[PDB]
Amino acid sequence: XXGXXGXXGXXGXXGXXGXXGXXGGXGXXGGXGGXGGXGXXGXXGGXGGXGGXXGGXGXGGXGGXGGXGXXXGXXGXXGXX
Amino acid sequence: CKGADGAHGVXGCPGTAGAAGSVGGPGCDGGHGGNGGNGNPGCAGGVGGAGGASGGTGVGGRGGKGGSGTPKGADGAPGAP
């Protein structure tokens, strides 16, 4: 199976991001993404997303991460396969 | 500002569903739903994703466009204001 993923985001500032996911179809794989969000406090957060890819049974998915605050952020990447 | 859009679906049997758009962050509009994937011959098309709800602006994301196929997928709901 596979596909799905995505969502995440949230928080405020700052916050935001998430997204990504999807891909899959074909023989499956993909998904992932999401995360991001965060912020609050002194601001920052965000990022996440990524994931996706798949369809060919290379894997795909991953991504996410991000979030946190100050600070925080990054994440994303993954996908492909 | 606006939330992340949902991943577009991809072609297959059936075409995959578009993902719902992300909710807007505080003060932001909703993300758009992904379009539905198109179906190969004899296969259904995917549904469009729902638009994401607004983050207080009154502007929800658009529903994704349904994929064509046998039969075609529906468009997604727009996001709540």
mmCIF file with all atom_site columns, all heavy atoms in Angstrom, chain A residues 28-76:
data_model
loop_
_atom_site.group_PDB
_atom_site.id
_atom_site.type_symbol
_atom_site.label_atom_id
_atom_site.label_alt_id
_atom_site.label_comp_id
_atom_site.label_asym_id
_atom_site.label_entity_id
_atom_site.label_seq_id
_atom_site.pdbx_PDB_ins_code
_atom_site.Cartn_x
_atom_site.Cartn_y
_atom_site.Cartn_z
_atom_site.occupancy
_atom_site.B_iso_or_equiv
_atom_site.pdbx_formal_charge
_atom_site.auth_seq_id
_atom_site.auth_comp_id
_atom_site.auth_asym_id
_atom_site.auth_atom_id
_atom_site.pdbx_PDB_model_num
ATOM 1   N N  . UNK A 1 28 ? 2.586  1.334  -5.078 1.00 0.00 ? 28 UNK A N  1
ATOM 2   C CA . UNK A 1 28 ? 2.484  1.747  -3.691 1.00 0.00 ? 28 UNK A CA 1
ATOM 3   C C  . UNK A 1 28 ? 3.664  2.594  -3.263 1.00 0.00 ? 28 UNK A C  1
ATOM 4   O O  . UNK A 1 28 ? 4.283  3.276  -4.091 1.00 0.00 ? 28 UNK A O  1
ATOM 5   C CB . UNK A 1 28 ? 1.211  2.573  -3.488 1.00 0.00 ? 28 UNK A CB 1
ATOM 6   N N  . UNK A 1 29 ? 3.963  2.623  -1.972 1.00 0.00 ? 29 UNK A N  1
ATOM 7   C CA . UNK A 1 29 ? 4.989  3.482  -1.396 1.00 0.00 ? 29 UNK A CA 1
ATOM 8   C C  . UNK A 1 29 ? 4.507  4.900  -1.300 1.00 0.00 ? 29 UNK A C  1
ATOM 9   O O  . UNK A 1 29 ? 3.286  5.177  -1.370 1.00 0.00 ? 29 UNK A O  1
ATOM 10  C CB . UNK A 1 29 ? 5.315  3.015  0.015  1.00 0.00 ? 29 UNK A CB 1
ATOM 11  N N  . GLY A 1 30 ? 5.404  5.844  -1.126 1.00 0.00 ? 30 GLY A N  1
ATOM 12  C CA . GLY A 1 30 ? 5.029  7.229  -0.942 1.00 0.00 ? 30 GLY A CA 1
ATOM 13  C C  . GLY A 1 30 ? 4.485  7.537  0.415  1.00 0.00 ? 30 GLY A C  1
ATOM 14  O O  . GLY A 1 30 ? 4.842  6.913  1.414  1.00 0.00 ? 30 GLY A O  1
ATOM 15  N N  . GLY A 1 31 ? 3.626  8.546  0.509  1.00 0.00 ? 31 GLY A N  1
ATOM 16  C CA . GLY A 1 31 ? 3.143  9.053  1.774  1.00 0.00 ? 31 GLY A CA 1
ATOM 17  C C  . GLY A 1 31 ? 4.164  9.893  2.498  1.00 0.00 ? 31 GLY A C  1
ATOM 18  O O  . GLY A 1 31 ? 5.010  10.569 1.879  1.00 0.00 ? 31 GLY A O  1
ATOM 19  N N  . UNK A 1 32 ? 4.114  9.911  3.814  1.00 0.00 ? 32 UNK A N  1
ATOM 20  C CA . UNK A 1 32 ? 5.036  10.703 4.608  1.00 0.00 ? 32 UNK A CA 1
ATOM 21  C C  . UNK A 1 32 ? 4.651  12.142 4.623  1.00 0.00 ? 32 UNK A C  1
ATOM 22  O O  . UNK A 1 32 ? 3.472  12.500 4.541  1.00 0.00 ? 32 UNK A O  1
ATOM 23  C CB . UNK A 1 32 ? 5.123  10.128 6.027  1.00 0.00 ? 32 UNK A CB 1
ATOM 24  N N  . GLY A 1 33 ? 5.617  13.040 4.720  1.00 0.00 ? 33 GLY A N  1
ATOM 25  C CA . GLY A 1 33 ? 5.339  14.432 4.812  1.00 0.00 ? 33 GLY A CA 1
ATOM 26  C C  . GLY A 1 33 ? 4.720  14.821 6.124  1.00 0.00 ? 33 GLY A C  1
ATOM 27  O O  . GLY A 1 33 ? 4.911  14.158 7.138  1.00 0.00 ? 33 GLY A O  1
ATOM 28  N N  . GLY A 1 34 ? 3.968  15.901 6.155  1.00 0.00 ? 34 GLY A N  1
ATOM 29  C CA . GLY A 1 34 ? 3.438  16.422 7.386  1.00 0.00 ? 34 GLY A CA 1
ATOM 30  C C  . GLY A 1 34 ? 4.493  17.031 8.284  1.00 0.00 ? 34 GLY A C  1
ATOM 31  O O  . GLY A 1 34 ? 5.513  17.580 7.840  1.00 0.00 ? 34 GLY A O  1
ATOM 32  N N  . UNK A 1 35 ? 4.269  16.964 9.578  1.00 0.00 ? 35 UNK A N  1
ATOM 33  C CA . UNK A 1 35 ? 5.067  17.652 10.563 1.00 0.00 ? 35 UNK A CA 1
ATOM 34  C C  . UNK A 1 35 ? 5.047  19.127 10.349 1.00 0.00 ? 35 UNK A C  1
ATOM 35  O O  . UNK A 1 35 ? 3.996  19.694 10.022 1.00 0.00 ? 35 UNK A O  1
ATOM 36  C CB . UNK A 1 35 ? 4.473  17.414 11.975 1.00 0.00 ? 35 UNK A CB 1
ATOM 37  N N  . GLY A 1 36 ? 6.146  19.826 10.530 1.00 0.00 ? 36 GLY A N  1
ATOM 38  C CA . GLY A 1 36 ? 6.092  21.252 10.610 1.00 0.00 ? 36 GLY A CA 1
ATOM 39  C C  . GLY A 1 36 ? 5.303  21.749 11.789 1.00 0.00 ? 36 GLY A C  1
ATOM 40  O O  . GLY A 1 36 ? 5.283  21.109 12.827 1.00 0.00 ? 36 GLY A O  1
ATOM 41  N N  . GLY A 1 37 ? 4.669  22.911 11.691 1.00 0.00 ? 37 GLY A N  1
ATOM 42  C CA . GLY A 1 37 ? 3.963  23.510 12.789 1.00 0.00 ? 37 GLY A CA 1
ATOM 43  C C  . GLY A 1 37 ? 4.873  24.110 13.802 1.00 0.00 ? 37 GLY A C  1
ATOM 44  O O  . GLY A 1 37 ? 5.922  24.653 13.478 1.00 0.00 ? 37 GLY A O  1
ATOM 45  N N  . UNK A 1 38 ? 4.510  24.045 15.062 1.00 0.00 ? 38 UNK A N  1
ATOM 46  C CA . UNK A 1 38 ? 5.349  24.537 16.115 1.00 0.00 ? 38 UNK A CA 1
ATOM 47  C C  . UNK A 1 38 ? 5.219  26.032 16.250 1.00 0.00 ? 38 UNK A C  1
ATOM 48  O O  . UNK A 1 38 ? 4.138  26.596 16.122 1.00 0.00 ? 38 UNK A O  1
ATOM 49  C CB . UNK A 1 38 ? 4.996  23.850 17.428 1.00 0.00 ? 38 UNK A CB 1
ATOM 50  N N  . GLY A 1 39 ? 6.315  26.718 16.502 1.00 0.00 ? 39 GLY A N  1
ATOM 51  C CA . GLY A 1 39 ? 6.313  28.147 16.790 1.00 0.00 ? 39 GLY A CA 1
ATOM 52  C C  . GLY A 1 39 ? 5.950  28.393 18.230 1.00 0.00 ? 39 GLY A C  1
ATOM 53  O O  . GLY A 1 39 ? 6.522  27.785 19.143 1.00 0.00 ? 39 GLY A O  1
ATOM 54  N N  . UNK A 1 40 ? 5.012  29.290 18.494 1.00 0.00 ? 40 UNK A N  1
ATOM 55  C CA . UNK A 1 40 ? 4.667  29.674 19.841 1.00 0.00 ? 40 UNK A CA 1
ATOM 56  C C  . UNK A 1 40 ? 5.889  30.414 20.436 1.00 0.00 ? 40 UNK A C  1
ATOM 57  O O  . UNK A 1 40 ? 6.882  30.684 19.733 1.00 0.00 ? 40 UNK A O  1
ATOM 58  C CB . UNK A 1 40 ? 3.361  30.498 19.831 1.00 0.00 ? 40 UNK A CB 1
ATOM 59  N N  . UNK A 1 41 ? 5.888  30.688 21.738 1.00 0.00 ? 41 UNK A N  1
ATOM 60  C CA . UNK A 1 41 ? 7.107  31.206 22.344 1.00 0.00 ? 41 UNK A CA 1
ATOM 61  C C  . UNK A 1 41 ? 7.722  32.409 21.608 1.00 0.00 ? 41 UNK A C  1
ATOM 62  O O  . UNK A 1 41 ? 7.017  33.384 21.287 1.00 0.00 ? 41 UNK A O  1
ATOM 63  C CB . UNK A 1 41 ? 6.665  31.573 23.771 1.00 0.00 ? 41 UNK A CB 1
ATOM 64  N N  . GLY A 1 42 ? 9.013  32.372 21.285 1.00 0.00 ? 42 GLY A N  1
ATOM 65  C CA . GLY A 1 42 ? 9.729  33.398 20.553 1.00 0.00 ? 42 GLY A CA 1
ATOM 66  C C  . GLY A 1 42 ? 9.563  33.324 19.048 1.00 0.00 ? 42 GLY A C  1
ATOM 67  O O  . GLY A 1 42 ? 10.166 34.132 18.313 1.00 0.00 ? 42 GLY A O  1
ATOM 68  N N  . UNK A 1 43 ? 8.772  32.390 18.529 1.00 0.00 ? 43 UNK A N  1
ATOM 69  C CA . UNK A 1 43 ? 8.473  32.274 17.111 1.00 0.00 ? 43 UNK A CA 1
ATOM 70  C C  . UNK A 1 43 ? 9.174  31.061 16.482 1.00 0.00 ? 43 UNK A C  1
ATOM 71  O O  . UNK A 1 43 ? 9.351  30.038 17.139 1.00 0.00 ? 43 UNK A O  1
ATOM 72  C CB . UNK A 1 43 ? 6.971  32.109 16.916 1.00 0.00 ? 43 UNK A CB 1
ATOM 73  N N  . UNK A 1 44 ? 9.564  31.110 15.209 1.00 0.00 ? 44 UNK A N  1
ATOM 74  C CA . UNK A 1 44 ? 10.217 29.989 14.542 1.00 0.00 ? 44 UNK A CA 1
ATOM 75  C C  . UNK A 1 44 ? 9.252  28.858 14.261 1.00 0.00 ? 44 UNK A C  1
ATOM 76  O O  . UNK A 1 44 ? 8.061  29.089 14.043 1.00 0.00 ? 44 UNK A O  1
ATOM 77  C CB . UNK A 1 44 ? 10.853 30.426 13.247 1.00 0.00 ? 44 UNK A CB 1
ATOM 78  N N  . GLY A 1 45 ? 9.725  27.616 14.248 1.00 0.00 ? 45 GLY A N  1
ATOM 79  C CA . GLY A 1 45 ? 8.957  26.481 13.788 1.00 0.00 ? 45 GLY A CA 1
ATOM 80  C C  . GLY A 1 45 ? 8.865  26.398 12.309 1.00 0.00 ? 45 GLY A C  1
ATOM 81  O O  . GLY A 1 45 ? 9.712  26.934 11.576 1.00 0.00 ? 45 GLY A O  1
ATOM 82  N N  . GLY A 1 46 ? 7.828  25.761 11.796 1.00 0.00 ? 46 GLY A N  1
ATOM 83  C CA . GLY A 1 46 ? 7.641  25.577 10.381 1.00 0.00 ? 46 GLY A CA 1
ATOM 84  C C  . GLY A 1 46 ? 8.384  24.400 9.805  1.00 0.00 ? 46 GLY A C  1
ATOM 85  O O  . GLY A 1 46 ? 8.771  23.462 10.511 1.00 0.00 ? 46 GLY A O  1
ATOM 86  N N  . UNK A 1 47 ? 8.592  24.402 8.508  1.00 0.00 ? 47 UNK A N  1
ATOM 87  C CA . UNK A 1 47 ? 9.269  23.331 7.820  1.00 0.00 ? 47 UNK A CA 1
ATOM 88  C C  . UNK A 1 47 ? 8.390  22.111 7.751  1.00 0.00 ? 47 UNK A C  1
ATOM 89  O O  . UNK A 1 47 ? 7.166  22.198 7.613  1.00 0.00 ? 47 UNK A O  1
ATOM 90  C CB . UNK A 1 47 ? 9.703  23.779 6.401  1.00 0.00 ? 47 UNK A CB 1
ATOM 91  N N  . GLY A 1 48 ? 8.979  20.937 7.835  1.00 0.00 ? 48 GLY A N  1
ATOM 92  C CA . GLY A 1 48 ? 8.284  19.713 7.537  1.00 0.00 ? 48 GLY A CA 1
ATOM 93  C C  . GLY A 1 48 ? 7.977  19.573 6.077  1.00 0.00 ? 48 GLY A C  1
ATOM 94  O O  . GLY A 1 48 ? 8.678  20.103 5.222  1.00 0.00 ? 48 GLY A O  1
ATOM 95  N N  . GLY A 1 49 ? 6.954  18.810 5.749  1.00 0.00 ? 49 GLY A N  1
ATOM 96  C CA . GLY A 1 49 ? 6.612  18.521 4.420  1.00 0.00 ? 49 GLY A CA 1
ATOM 97  C C  . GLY A 1 49 ? 7.516  17.480 3.825  1.00 0.00 ? 49 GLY A C  1
ATOM 98  O O  . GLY A 1 49 ? 7.958  16.565 4.517  1.00 0.00 ? 49 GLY A O  1
ATOM 99  N N  . UNK A 1 50 ? 7.779  17.548 2.529  1.00 0.00 ? 50 UNK A N  1
ATOM 100 C CA . UNK A 1 50 ? 8.538  16.537 1.857  1.00 0.00 ? 50 UNK A CA 1
ATOM 101 C C  . UNK A 1 50 ? 7.789  15.229 1.815  1.00 0.00 ? 50 UNK A C  1
ATOM 102 O O  . UNK A 1 50 ? 6.555  15.197 1.727  1.00 0.00 ? 50 UNK A O  1
ATOM 103 C CB . UNK A 1 50 ? 8.891  16.975 0.425  1.00 0.00 ? 50 UNK A CB 1
ATOM 104 N N  . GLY A 1 51 ? 8.487  14.118 1.834  1.00 0.00 ? 51 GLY A N  1
ATOM 105 C CA . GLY A 1 51 ? 7.867  12.852 1.541  1.00 0.00 ? 51 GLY A CA 1
ATOM 106 C C  . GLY A 1 51 ? 7.380  12.752 0.124  1.00 0.00 ? 51 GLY A C  1
ATOM 107 O O  . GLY A 1 51 ? 7.940  13.387 -0.776 1.00 0.00 ? 51 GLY A O  1
ATOM 108 N N  . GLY A 1 52 ? 6.378  11.928 -0.136 1.00 0.00 ? 52 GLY A N  1
ATOM 109 C CA . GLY A 1 52 ? 5.908  11.684 -1.457 1.00 0.00 ? 52 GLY A CA 1
ATOM 110 C C  . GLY A 1 52 ? 6.771  10.692 -2.189 1.00 0.00 ? 52 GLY A C  1
ATOM 111 O O  . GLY A 1 52 ? 7.334  9.740  -1.611 1.00 0.00 ? 52 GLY A O  1
ATOM 112 N N  . UNK A 1 53 ? 6.867  10.825 -3.497 1.00 0.00 ? 53 UNK A N  1
ATOM 113 C CA . UNK A 1 53 ? 7.537  9.857  -4.319 1.00 0.00 ? 53 UNK A CA 1
ATOM 114 C C  . UNK A 1 53 ? 6.846  8.514  -4.272 1.00 0.00 ? 53 UNK A C  1
ATOM 115 O O  . UNK A 1 53 ? 5.615  8.435  -4.137 1.00 0.00 ? 53 UNK A O  1
ATOM 116 C CB . UNK A 1 53 ? 7.585  10.354 -5.752 1.00 0.00 ? 53 UNK A CB 1
ATOM 117 N N  . UNK A 1 54 ? 7.597  7.421  -4.410 1.00 0.00 ? 54 UNK A N  1
ATOM 118 C CA . UNK A 1 54 ? 6.982  6.107  -4.543 1.00 0.00 ? 54 UNK A CA 1
ATOM 119 C C  . UNK A 1 54 ? 6.312  5.918  -5.891 1.00 0.00 ? 54 UNK A C  1
ATOM 120 O O  . UNK A 1 54 ? 6.606  6.627  -6.863 1.00 0.00 ? 54 UNK A O  1
ATOM 121 C CB . UNK A 1 54 ? 7.996  4.986  -4.355 1.00 0.00 ? 54 UNK A CB 1
ATOM 122 N N  . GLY A 1 55 ? 5.411  4.938  -5.976 1.00 0.00 ? 55 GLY A N  1
ATOM 123 C CA . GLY A 1 55 ? 4.788  4.464  -7.197 1.00 0.00 ? 55 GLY A CA 1
ATOM 124 C C  . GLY A 1 55 ? 5.558  3.290  -7.781 1.00 0.00 ? 55 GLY A C  1
ATOM 125 O O  . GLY A 1 55 ? 4.971  2.314  -8.286 1.00 0.00 ? 55 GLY A O  1
ATOM 126 N N  . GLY A 1 56 ? 6.881  3.309  -7.736 1.00 0.00 ? 56 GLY A N  1
ATOM 127 C CA . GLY A 1 56 ? 7.731  2.292  -8.337 1.00 0.00 ? 56 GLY A CA 1
ATOM 128 C C  . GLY A 1 56 ? 8.295  1.303  -7.375 1.00 0.00 ? 56 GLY A C  1
ATOM 129 O O  . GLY A 1 56 ? 9.114  0.468  -7.760 1.00 0.00 ? 56 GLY A O  1
ATOM 130 N N  . UNK A 1 57 ? 7.930  1.336  -6.100 1.00 0.00 ? 57 UNK A N  1
ATOM 131 C CA . UNK A 1 57 ? 8.422  0.358  -5.133 1.00 0.00 ? 57 UNK A CA 1
ATOM 132 C C  . UNK A 1 57 ? 9.823  0.686  -4.680 1.00 0.00 ? 57 UNK A C  1
ATOM 133 O O  . UNK A 1 57 ? 10.474 -0.165 -4.092 1.00 0.00 ? 57 UNK A O  1
ATOM 134 C CB . UNK A 1 57 ? 7.524  0.357  -3.895 1.00 0.00 ? 57 UNK A CB 1
ATOM 135 N N  . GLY A 1 58 ? 10.320 1.903  -4.915 1.00 0.00 ? 58 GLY A N  1
ATOM 136 C CA . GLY A 1 58 ? 11.586 2.378  -4.387 1.00 0.00 ? 58 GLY A CA 1
ATOM 137 C C  . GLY A 1 58 ? 11.513 2.816  -2.942 1.00 0.00 ? 58 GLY A C  1
ATOM 138 O O  . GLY A 1 58 ? 12.584 3.047  -2.314 1.00 0.00 ? 58 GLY A O  1
ATOM 139 N N  . UNK A 1 59 ? 10.321 2.937  -2.355 1.00 0.00 ? 59 UNK A N  1
ATOM 140 C CA . UNK A 1 59 ? 10.130 3.377  -0.999 1.00 0.00 ? 59 UNK A CA 1
ATOM 141 C C  . UNK A 1 59 ? 9.344  4.682  -1.020 1.00 0.00 ? 59 UNK A C  1
ATOM 142 O O  . UNK A 1 59 ? 8.100  4.701  -1.134 1.00 0.00 ? 59 UNK A O  1
ATOM 143 C CB . UNK A 1 59 ? 9.428  2.325  -0.129 1.00 0.00 ? 59 UNK A CB 1
ATOM 144 N N  . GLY A 1 60 ? 10.051 5.813  -0.946 1.00 0.00 ? 60 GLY A N  1
ATOM 145 C CA . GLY A 1 60 ? 9.438  7.111  -0.857 1.00 0.00 ? 60 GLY A CA 1
ATOM 146 C C  . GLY A 1 60 ? 8.920  7.354  0.530  1.00 0.00 ? 60 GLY A C  1
ATOM 147 O O  . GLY A 1 60 ? 9.222  6.616  1.479  1.00 0.00 ? 60 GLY A O  1
ATOM 148 N N  . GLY A 1 61 ? 8.135  8.381  0.725  1.00 0.00 ? 61 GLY A N  1
ATOM 149 C CA . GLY A 1 61 ? 7.756  8.783  2.049  1.00 0.00 ? 61 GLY A CA 1
ATOM 150 C C  . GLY A 1 61 ? 8.880  9.418  2.802  1.00 0.00 ? 61 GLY A C  1
ATOM 151 O O  . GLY A 1 61 ? 9.836  9.948  2.209  1.00 0.00 ? 61 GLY A O  1
ATOM 152 N N  . UNK A 1 62 ? 8.816  9.419  4.119  1.00 0.00 ? 62 UNK A N  1
ATOM 153 C CA . UNK A 1 62 ? 9.761  10.147 4.948  1.00 0.00 ? 62 UNK A CA 1
ATOM 154 C C  . UNK A 1 62 ? 9.351  11.609 4.994  1.00 0.00 ? 62 UNK A C  1
ATOM 155 O O  . UNK A 1 62 ? 8.144  11.941 5.041  1.00 0.00 ? 62 UNK A O  1
ATOM 156 C CB . UNK A 1 62 ? 9.789  9.559  6.357  1.00 0.00 ? 62 UNK A CB 1
ATOM 157 N N  . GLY A 1 63 ? 10.295 12.537 5.005  1.00 0.00 ? 63 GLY A N  1
ATOM 158 C CA . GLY A 1 63 ? 9.984  13.911 5.240  1.00 0.00 ? 63 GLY A CA 1
ATOM 159 C C  . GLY A 1 63 ? 9.460  14.130 6.632  1.00 0.00 ? 63 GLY A C  1
ATOM 160 O O  . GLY A 1 63 ? 9.826  13.437 7.552  1.00 0.00 ? 63 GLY A O  1
ATOM 161 N N  . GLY A 1 64 ? 8.576  15.093 6.839  1.00 0.00 ? 64 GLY A N  1
ATOM 162 C CA . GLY A 1 64 ? 8.142  15.472 8.165  1.00 0.00 ? 64 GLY A CA 1
ATOM 163 C C  . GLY A 1 64 ? 9.233  16.172 8.931  1.00 0.00 ? 64 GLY A C  1
ATOM 164 O O  . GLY A 1 64 ? 10.041 16.932 8.372  1.00 0.00 ? 64 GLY A O  1
ATOM 165 N N  . UNK A 1 65 ? 9.313  15.971 10.233 1.00 0.00 ? 65 UNK A N  1
ATOM 166 C CA . UNK A 1 65 ? 10.226 16.720 11.042 1.00 0.00 ? 65 UNK A CA 1
ATOM 167 C C  . UNK A 1 65 ? 9.745  18.147 11.181 1.00 0.00 ? 65 UNK A C  1
ATOM 168 O O  . UNK A 1 65 ? 8.525  18.412 11.323 1.00 0.00 ? 65 UNK A O  1
ATOM 169 C CB . UNK A 1 65 ? 10.354 16.084 12.423 1.00 0.00 ? 65 UNK A CB 1
ATOM 170 N N  . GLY A 1 66 ? 10.650 19.111 11.177 1.00 0.00 ? 66 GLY A N  1
ATOM 171 C CA . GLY A 1 66 ? 10.303 20.496 11.371 1.00 0.00 ? 66 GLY A CA 1
ATOM 172 C C  . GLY A 1 66 ? 9.679  20.721 12.714 1.00 0.00 ? 66 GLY A C  1
ATOM 173 O O  . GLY A 1 66 ? 9.938  20.006 13.670 1.00 0.00 ? 66 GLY A O  1
ATOM 174 N N  . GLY A 1 67 ? 8.850  21.737 12.837 1.00 0.00 ? 67 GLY A N  1
ATOM 175 C CA . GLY A 1 67 ? 8.227  22.058 14.083 1.00 0.00 ? 67 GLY A CA 1
ATOM 176 C C  . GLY A 1 67 ? 9.172  22.622 15.074 1.00 0.00 ? 67 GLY A C  1
ATOM 177 O O  . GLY A 1 67 ? 10.188 23.233 14.716 1.00 0.00 ? 67 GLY A O  1
ATOM 178 N N  . UNK A 1 68 ? 8.915  22.438 16.356 1.00 0.00 ? 68 UNK A N  1
ATOM 179 C CA . UNK A 1 68 ? 9.710  23.065 17.388 1.00 0.00 ? 68 UNK A CA 1
ATOM 180 C C  . UNK A 1 68 ? 9.518  24.567 17.351 1.00 0.00 ? 68 UNK A C  1
ATOM 181 O O  . UNK A 1 68 ? 8.529  25.071 16.770 1.00 0.00 ? 68 UNK A O  1
ATOM 182 C CB . UNK A 1 68 ? 9.301  22.558 18.761 1.00 0.00 ? 68 UNK A CB 1
ATOM 183 N N  . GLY A 1 69 ? 10.418 25.329 17.949 1.00 0.00 ? 69 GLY A N  1
ATOM 184 C CA . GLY A 1 69 ? 10.288 26.764 17.996 1.00 0.00 ? 69 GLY A CA 1
ATOM 185 C C  . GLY A 1 69 ? 11.553 27.437 18.412 1.00 0.00 ? 69 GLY A C  1
ATOM 186 O O  . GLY A 1 69 ? 12.417 26.808 19.019 1.00 0.00 ? 69 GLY A O  1
ATOM 187 N N  . UNK A 1 70 ? 11.674 28.722 18.122 1.00 0.00 ? 70 UNK A N  1
ATOM 188 C CA . UNK A 1 70 ? 12.870 29.543 18.393 1.00 0.00 ? 70 UNK A CA 1
ATOM 189 C C  . UNK A 1 70 ? 13.188 29.979 16.985 1.00 0.00 ? 70 UNK A C  1
ATOM 190 O O  . UNK A 1 70 ? 12.889 31.139 16.675 1.00 0.00 ? 70 UNK A O  1
ATOM 191 C CB . UNK A 1 70 ? 12.442 30.661 19.350 1.00 0.00 ? 70 UNK A CB 1
ATOM 192 N N  . UNK A 1 71 ? 14.126 29.317 16.332 1.00 0.00 ? 71 UNK A N  1
ATOM 193 C CA . UNK A 1 71 ? 14.364 27.887 16.385 1.00 0.00 ? 71 UNK A CA 1
ATOM 194 C C  . UNK A 1 71 ? 13.442 26.907 15.718 1.00 0.00 ? 71 UNK A C  1
ATOM 195 O O  . UNK A 1 71 ? 12.517 27.278 14.999 1.00 0.00 ? 71 UNK A O  1
ATOM 196 C CB . UNK A 1 71 ? 15.711 27.803 15.697 1.00 0.00 ? 71 UNK A CB 1
ATOM 197 N N  . UNK A 1 72 ? 13.706 25.617 15.930 1.00 0.00 ? 72 UNK A N  1
ATOM 198 C CA . UNK A 1 72 ? 13.041 24.538 15.218 1.00 0.00 ? 72 UNK A CA 1
ATOM 199 C C  . UNK A 1 72 ? 13.188 24.697 13.698 1.00 0.00 ? 72 UNK A C  1
ATOM 200 O O  . UNK A 1 72 ? 14.219 25.163 13.197 1.00 0.00 ? 72 UNK A O  1
ATOM 201 C CB . UNK A 1 72 ? 13.598 23.174 15.679 1.00 0.00 ? 72 UNK A CB 1
ATOM 202 N N  . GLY A 1 73 ? 12.176 24.321 12.937 1.00 0.00 ? 73 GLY A N  1
ATOM 203 C CA . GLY A 1 73 ? 12.205 24.366 11.506 1.00 0.00 ? 73 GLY A CA 1
ATOM 204 C C  . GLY A 1 73 ? 12.996 23.250 10.887 1.00 0.00 ? 73 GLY A C  1
ATOM 205 O O  . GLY A 1 73 ? 13.270 22.216 11.518 1.00 0.00 ? 73 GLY A O  1
ATOM 206 N N  . UNK A 1 74 ? 13.361 23.395 9.626  1.00 0.00 ? 74 UNK A N  1
ATOM 207 C CA . UNK A 1 74 ? 13.970 22.328 8.854  1.00 0.00 ? 74 UNK A CA 1
ATOM 208 C C  . UNK A 1 74 ? 13.027 21.177 8.641  1.00 0.00 ? 74 UNK A C  1
ATOM 209 O O  . UNK A 1 74 ? 11.808 21.339 8.592  1.00 0.00 ? 74 UNK A O  1
ATOM 210 C CB . UNK A 1 74 ? 14.412 22.861 7.510  1.00 0.00 ? 74 UNK A CB 1
ATOM 211 N N  . UNK A 1 75 ? 13.568 19.976 8.491  1.00 0.00 ? 75 UNK A N  1
ATOM 212 C CA . UNK A 1 75 ? 12.779 18.835 8.118  1.00 0.00 ? 75 UNK A CA 1
ATOM 213 C C  . UNK A 1 75 ? 12.473 18.831 6.641  1.00 0.00 ? 75 UNK A C  1
ATOM 214 O O  . UNK A 1 75 ? 13.147 19.479 5.826  1.00 0.00 ? 75 UNK A O  1
ATOM 215 C CB . UNK A 1 75 ? 13.511 17.544 8.442  1.00 0.00 ? 75 UNK A CB 1
ATOM 216 N N  . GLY A 1 76 ? 11.452 18.102 6.227  1.00 0.00 ? 76 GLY A N  1
ATOM 217 C CA . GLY A 1 76 ? 11.167 17.922 4.841  1.00 0.00 ? 76 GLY A CA 1
ATOM 218 C C  . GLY A 1 76 ? 12.120 16.948 4.188  1.00 0.00 ? 76 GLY A C  1
ATOM 219 O O  . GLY A 1 76 ? 12.618 16.024 4.821  1.00 0.00 ? 76 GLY A O  1
#
